[PDB]
């Protein structure tokens, strides 16, 4: 049987990668970071509180100018926040209230959102009269949209519930490149600092690395236990972290091709919803389903702080490009900024 | 310097805040419902009598605003996007009572929804659809009861149960036996936070919206009593 031979060929190939990965694992990150100093207890207090959203907040994104941010809530509203003065800047109604993600253009001229409607919408913030209007609607996905990130004013990468990721041309509205290979639902994605590659996680306890320029899966990472909910790139672009339903966070390396460090605790039996790093990459901040956010020492895997200023589960998290503040959203319809 | 710009920013905030205050009144004035069901349940006819990945339908009963969402064109894996309906007023569940052991599959789906941690505070309205088809199959002896579920041999009509006018006892036992199957799961893991409302309905029953309106009234009434801690 050809199918049996192919299964045996795949099994032998999987064994070869396991042997190759085993040889490179002469040590672990914990052993290397054994003699370094701990980061110390991290104490942070809320500085700002943004109110006005009606339903639960599902996503948020910082701008490049580090004071403007956009947030999405499931009541069908996009609000642009001036974090310095707390004043609202824009209020964009949505065609569908079941929004699941939002994004901010690097130039600050556009915002994007998407959800259960399988459509990604682009809004123009620099209209002649100053009133926000929709600019383009991208369609073609057969599943709910989970995340989207801009590359420039004309390009964007999206992820969907159809186990597929795609790259779009905003001006023409066409799908330039399609990424396939995942078996489970794709929940999050993050672009590299040079925007030449991006990583994503799916509901199959696996992560994959893609090449944007020519559209193939370069590397595949396993080791997690359940569906992966969050993913983000390390500041240097040579590592990434993943949060899963197994109440355990993990760190990977693109050159080592295997797991480097695992973050877990006995009392934590709830999954991770959001993951993000700091500017130096020494601190790893993650949101949890138990209505709090914890701070992890990436090098030492020791919990260095806890944020418990939310009445519901933390659904989104973000760090400014300047590294000067951290903003978190939750199902209690409140945005909190910490420093 | 920047005081003029700062004043211009605050006047923009207050203008936005007035619109958001008006939108808050409208948002709370409508009740959101999630329409869910197994295959061949007939929910398409129900939603018809009151591509994109979701559908919307608006209807009014006694000047009350309702907004029903039908989740279509989505993948069969459901454990992720089901969490978006954790705050809806109620979840309408439609099953094929007449029916490869499709009834067992519906029971497992109902059990998972009932025991989901994010849906433990949401009540479920259950419609035992295809009542007419169930009666015909039972009369002709084609229904596969006593094969899917051997428990039908020892089952008896409930004491508080009342048969329909002119209804033969054979179909009355069959329809109630399926009804108690869902109640067995509903009874367990219940602490009064959510309830189940089973109804025997047909695909073309025009009074389905009235059943939802009455069931939503009870849910709201119990919700108010819970805040005052009377219950």
């Amino acid at each position, epitope marked *: 049987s050809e199918l049996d031979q192919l299964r045996q060929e795949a099994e032998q190939l999987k064994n070869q990668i396991r042997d190759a990965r085993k040889a490179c694992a002469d040590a672990t990150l914990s052993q290397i970071t054994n003699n370094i100093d701990p980061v110390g207890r991290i104490q942070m207090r809320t500085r700002r509180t943004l109110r006005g959203h009606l339903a639960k907040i599902y996503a948020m994104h910082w701008g490049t100018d580090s004071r403007l941010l956009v947030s999405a809530s499931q009541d069908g509203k996009l609000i642009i926040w001036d974090s310095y003065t707390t004043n609202k800047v824009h209020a964009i109604p949505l065609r569908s209230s079941w929004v699941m993600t939002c994004a901010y253009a690097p130039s600050g001229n556009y915002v994007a959102c998407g959800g259960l409607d399988n459509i990604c919408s682009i809004y123009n913030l620099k209209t002649r009269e100053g009133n926000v209007r929709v600019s383009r609607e991208l369609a073609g996905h057969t599943g709910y949209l989970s995340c989207c990130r801009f590359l420039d004013d004309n390009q964007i990468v999206t992820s969907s519930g159809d186990t597929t990721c795609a790259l779009w041309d905003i001006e023409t509205g066409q799908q330039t490149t399609t990424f396939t290979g995942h078996t489970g639902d794709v929940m999050s994605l993050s672009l590299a600092p040079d925007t030449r590659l991006f990583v994503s996680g799916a509901c199959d306890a696996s992560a994959k690395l893609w090449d944007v320029r020519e559209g193939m899966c370069r590397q595949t990472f396993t080791g997690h236990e359940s569906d992966i909910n969050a993913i983000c790139f390390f500041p240097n672009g040579n590592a990434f972290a993943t949060g899963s339903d197994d109440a355990t966070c993990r760190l990977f390396d693109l050159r080592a091709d295997q797991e480097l460090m695992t973050y877990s605790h006995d009392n934590i039996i709830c*999954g991770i919803t959001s993951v993000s790093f700091s500017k130096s990459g020494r601190l790893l901040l993650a949101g949890y389903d138990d209505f709090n956010c914890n701070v992890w020492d990436a090098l030492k895997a020791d919990r260095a702080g806890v944020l418990a200023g939310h009445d519901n589960r933390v659904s989104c998290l973000g760090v400014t490009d300047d590294g000067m503040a951290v903003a978190t959203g939750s199902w209690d319809s409140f945005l909190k900024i910490w420093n | 310097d920047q005081r003029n710009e700062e004043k211009a920013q605050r006047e923009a905030n207050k203008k936005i805040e007035k619109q958001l205050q008006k939108d808050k009144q409208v948002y709370r004035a409508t009740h959101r419902l999630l329409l869910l069901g197994a295959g061949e349940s007939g929910k398409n006819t129900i939603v018809k009598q009151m591509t994109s990945g979701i559908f919307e339908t608006k209807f009014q009963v006694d000047k009350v605003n309702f907004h029903m969402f039908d989740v279509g064109a989505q993948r*069969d*894996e459901r*454990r992720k996007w089901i969490q978006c309906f954790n705050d809806v007023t109620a979840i309408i569940f439609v099953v094929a009572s007449s029916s*490869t052991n499709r009834l067992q599959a519906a029971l497992k789906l109902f059990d998972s929804i009932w025991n989901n941690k994010w849906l433990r505070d949401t009540s479920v309205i259950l419609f035992l659809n295809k009542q007419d088809l169930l009666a015909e199959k039972v009369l002709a002896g084609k229904s596969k009861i006593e094969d*899917y579920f051997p428990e039908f041999a020892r089952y008896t009509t409930p004491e508080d149960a009342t048969p329909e006018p002119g209804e033969d006892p054979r179909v009355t036992r069959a329809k109630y036996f399926i009804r108690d199957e869902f109640l067995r799961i509903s009874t367990a*893991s219940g602490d009064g936070r959510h309830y189940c409302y089973p109804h025997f309905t047909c695909s073309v029953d025009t009074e389905n919206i009235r059943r939802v309106f009455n069931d939503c009234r009870d849910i709201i009434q119990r919700m108010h009593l819970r805040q005052y801690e009377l219950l």
Partner: nanobody
Amino acid sequence: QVQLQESGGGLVQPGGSLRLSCAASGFTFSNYKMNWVRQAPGKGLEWVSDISQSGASISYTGSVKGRFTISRDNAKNTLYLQMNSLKPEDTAVYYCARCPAPFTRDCFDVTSTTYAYRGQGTQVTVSS
């Protein structure tokens, strides 16, 4: 990588007996609920039986009650299905499935067309 490998089964006379063994590796076996799912030829996935984390709770589908029996071994990280008095209808491909979440009672997508935590399965044929 999460792996579920099944073993056993094969040709059997009607009214005979068979034993199915599920080999579990790569995950904590005691933290998850396990289910048995079979697929008859020309039909879709169907749920057969399940067992709780510690084995205190057991449930079967009505059509196989008494005939089949499910057991779990935490130490060996394996799951069993004892089959007795097999009928011709019992012929199908039996898969070993896991619930997607740990420390959780409910679990979805077990009988879905595509599932990331389902085994390859073994073929069971009942005929003379």
